[PDB]
Amino acid sequence: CAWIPAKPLVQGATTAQPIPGPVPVANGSIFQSAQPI
Amino acid sequence: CAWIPAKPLVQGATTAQPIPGPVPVANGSIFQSAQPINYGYQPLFEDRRPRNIGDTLTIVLQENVSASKSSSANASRDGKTSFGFDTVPRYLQGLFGNSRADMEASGGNSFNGKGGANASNTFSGTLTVTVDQVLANGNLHVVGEKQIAINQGTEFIRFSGVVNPRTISGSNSVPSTQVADARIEYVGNGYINEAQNMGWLQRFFLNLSPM
Amino acid sequence: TEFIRFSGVVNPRTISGSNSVPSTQVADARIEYVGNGYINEAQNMGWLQRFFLNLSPM
Amino acid sequence: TEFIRFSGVVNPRTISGSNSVPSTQVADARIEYVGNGYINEAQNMGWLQRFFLNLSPM
Amino acid sequence: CAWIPAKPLVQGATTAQPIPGPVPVANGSIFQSAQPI
Amino acid sequence: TEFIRFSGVVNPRTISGSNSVPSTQVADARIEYVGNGYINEAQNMGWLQRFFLNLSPM
Amino acid sequence: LNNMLSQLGITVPTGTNMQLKNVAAVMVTASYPPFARQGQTIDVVVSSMGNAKSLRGGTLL
Ligand SMILES: *C(=O)CCCCCCC
Ligand SMILES: *C(=O)CCCCCCC
Ligand SMILES: *C(=O)CCCCCCC
């Protein structure tokens, strides 16, 4: 049937939320690098 | 029915109201900057590749697979033997007379088997996905979904996979053949989709019929 | 739903400049192209015909 | 499912510059190309016909 | 039948997870080489 | 299954530069090209016809 | 050169025209000294390897 609930091939949430970057440390620098892996 | 209230695909308010800017501080300056959300360091000459969770990336779906196979076999055999003493001389009548040695036999055999199979699939389109995780070696896990509703039903195109950043082109796009764990899905609903499922009786027969 | 699965062993000096290898250079190649749904069910032989294909005298 | 199996003995000075050897230069060549499934079952002779092919007088 | 469970030709998991590299030793060097076979 | 067997004696000064000899330069050449399976069984004469081919008067 | 550019963050499309004049491909050779310790320095020899005219004022990457 077409009314029986089936799960989709691509499961879970299909979107992501950007996260705010860290607060810049108050040295004399403009270049701020978030923790780099 | 057409009078039963259904919710639209695009829900909520479809408009926004501009907000008045802040009152300018009375320093000696004309340049007034509203509170700017500081984003991190951004390179200048490097291409716009996705780097963090939430960045977007265009996938160019171009799939084309085609496999096939076949085989056969055959065998045959014929045979036909005969012997007939038409006029037997007298001194041989004691051995080949009265057709006591005539003979005639035939035989045949045949066989032919064969078989084959094939499969194919194509896919063409474009879809923008979003990064939802950055792996330990720099690869990006991407997911995406596009929903369309043209006048009667609703179609869903979903995509999921893993991308290597050094494959993204200069225009922030990747062909779908370079994604590792590609999961593509193109489905729909409405009665147009319901008209393409087999009836439960025919589905039962297709599996349990003897032939 | 169609599934294309692949497994094998690759020698690094055969990978091209665009990070690609033709499948004829993989050692223990296992390729699989299968599917499900009623489109796939319409291509299996019926159990009676399958029985006859094996146990029929000719 | 189709299986292609190969076994043999190779002399290193016959391997080309692209790491390839034609199969006519392998000594104890054993090549095999078989399959299974009902497509392969449809190519074996029936047991009765197989019996007749061997024991029929002609 | 088509409902009888059969195992696929390619068995096991068809994906792998990258492992984080080792922590770099604090000599005066930028070049850090993970244990090379 | 098909079998190609070969046996013989070779004189080294006849081997070409590519390590190859034409079979007409081998002394005690024994060549054999046989097979098995029902394809080969379909090419033997029936025992009755084989008997008649030898003992029939004409 | 395309490999290096891609590593740095710039992906040049494939099958495009590219004709340089200020770049040469070279082989670098050196002698690993006895009891060498990490951080020390040695001297290298640089040699052209295809149809280059001169390495007069070049820099080794
Ligand atoms: C969808 O609702 C189809 C379900 C019918 C299956 C049983 C019919 C008697
Ligand atoms: C729209 O109003 C259609 C609803 C009719 C459904 C029931 C008919 C007996
Ligand atoms: C798939 O479910 C087919 C199984 C039927 C085999 C036995 C039929 C009596």
**From CA F57, how far away is CA B103, in angstroms rounded?**
11
Residue entry with tokens 């495009």: G16
Sign of the torsion angle spanned by Cα atoms B31, B37, B40, B44: negative
- G21 φ, ψ (degrees, to nearest 5): -135, -20
Sequence-separated (6 or more) residues with CB below 8 Å from residue B14: none
**Residues B112 and B74: beta-carbon distance below 8 Å:** yes
Question: Which chains are adjacent to chain G, needing at least 3 Cβ pairs under 8 Å?
Answer: B, E
Sequence-separated (6 or more) residues with CB below 8 Å from residue B71: B114, B115, B116, D35, D39, D40, D43
**From CA G8, how far away is CA G53, in angstroms rounded?**
28
Residue B140: CB atoms within 10 A of its CB come to 26
Query: What order do you get walking across the sheet with B154-163 strand by strand?
Result: B173-175, B56-83, B103-134, B140-148, B154-163, B183-189
How many residues in chain A?
Answer: 37
SS3 of residue B133 by DSSP: strand
**From CA A8, how far away is CA B155, in angstroms rounded?**
13
F chain contacts of residue D58, beta-carbon cutoff 8 Å? 46, 48-49
Question: What single-letter DSSP state applies at residue D24?
Answer: G
Query: Which of G7, G8, G13 shows the shortest C-beta gap to B169?
Result: G13
Smallest Cα distance from E12 to chain G, Å: 34
Residue B130: CB atoms within 10 A of its CB come to 21
Find the closest chain B residue to F45 by CA distance: B79
- As beta bridge partners, residue B112 has B74
Sequence-separated (6 or more) residues with CB below 8 Å from residue C45: C53, D38
C38 within ligand 3 shell (Cβ under 6 A): no
Residue entry with tokens 């409902």: E3
Please choose, from the candidates B106, B140, B111, B146, the residue with its C-alpha nearest in 3D space to the C-alpha of residue B125: B146
Within 13 Å of residue B111, how many CA atoms lie on the same side as its CB? 24
CA dihedral B186, B189, B194, B196 (to 10 degrees): -20
**From CA C25, how far away is CA C9, in angstroms rounded?**
9
B chain contacts of residue C56, beta-carbon cutoff 8 Å? none
> What residue ranges in chain G does DSSP mark as E strands?
26-30, 44-48
**From CA B115, how far away is CA B121, in angstroms rounded?**
21
**From CA G56, how far away is CA G48, in angstroms rounded?**
11
The three-point CA angle D16-D18-D24 to 5° equals: 45
**Residues G43 and G28: beta-carbon distance below 8 Å:** no
Cα(A2) to ligand 2 centroid in Å equals 21
C chain contacts of residue D5, beta-carbon cutoff 8 Å? none
**From CA B10, how far away is CA B149, in angstroms rounded?**
10
Q: What Å distances lie between residue A34 and B41, B49, B165, G30, CA to CA?
A: 8, 17, 19, 39
Please choose, from the candidates B24, B186, B105, the residue with its C-alpha nearest in 3D space to the C-alpha of residue A10: B186
Q: What Å distances lie between residue B150 and B158, C13, F21, CA to CA?
A: 17, 51, 74
* Alpha-helix residue ranges (DSSP H) falling in chain B: 93-96, 191-194, 200-208
Sequence-separated (6 or more) residues with CB below 8 Å from residue F37: F1
Query: Which of E15, E18, E21 shows the shortest C-beta gap to B181?
Result: E15
The three-point CA angle D40-D42-D48 to 5° equals: 120
Residue entry with tokens 């035939």: B106
Which helix (H) or strand (E) segment holds residue F39: the answer is: helix F38-41
* Alpha-helix residue ranges (DSSP H) falling in D1-58: 38-41, 47-55
**From CA B58, how far away is CA C24, in angstroms rounded?**
31
Q: What Å distances lie between residue B133 and A16, B125, D30, CA to CA?
A: 9, 24, 50
- E20 φ, ψ (degrees, to nearest 5): -65, 140
**From CA B162, how far away is CA B138, in angstroms rounded?**
10
Sequence-separated (6 or more) residues with CB below 8 Å from residue B99: B84, B85
Tell me which amino acid residue B115 is: G
Please choose, from the candidates B93, B117, B187, B201, the residue with its C-alpha nearest in 3D space to the C-alpha of residue B148: B187
Deposited experimental method: cryo-EM
Select the residue from G2, G3, G11 to test the B interface by mutation, using most B Cβ atoms within 10 A.
G11
- As beta bridge partners, residue B108 has B78
With an 8 Å Cβ cutoff, is G29 touching chain E?
A: no
**C20-28, long-range: CB within 8 Å, 24+ apart, which pairs?**
none
Q: What Å distances lie between residue B31 and B21, B24, B28, CA to CA?
A: 13, 9, 9
Tell me which amino acid residue B167 is: T
Whether chains D and A touch (3+ CB pairs under 8 A) is answered by no
Sign of the torsion angle spanned by Cα atoms B20, B26, B30, B33: negative
